[PDB]
């Protein structure tokens, strides 16, 4: 059987930050649970926010305002900054 995880990506970002210190398997599972939880957080908040506007479409606007309202001003500020930078650079 097969399964999906963030392992390789967490290791690559680890090499992008501190390419020395390693990560234990259990801590990697904790990070997998964290990202998997925040995914349902932002996704569900985007679903309810999309339901409040009487719209069937979820765009980057819903993710931007949702991330703003569900996160502290620092994390929402930098998250919206780098997020809009990556999206505007992508399109």
């Amino acid at each position: 059987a097969r399964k999906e995880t963030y392992s390789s990506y967490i290791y690559k970002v680890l090499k992008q930050t501190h390419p020395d210190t390693g990560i234990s398997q259990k801590s990697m599972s904790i990070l997998n649970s964290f990202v998997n939880d925040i995914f349902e957080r932002i996704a569900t908040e985007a679903s309810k926010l999309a339901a409040y506007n009487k719209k069937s479409t979820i765009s980057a606007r819903e993710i931007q305002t949702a991330v703003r309202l569900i996160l502290p001003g620092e994390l929402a500020k930098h998250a919206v900054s780098e997020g809009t930078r990556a999206v505007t650079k992508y399109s």
Binding site: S33, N36, D37
Partner: peptide
């Protein structure tokens, strides 16, 4: 409570 670790 959202118990992490085992069975995540």
């Amino acid at each position: 409570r959202t118990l992490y670790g085992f069975g995540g």
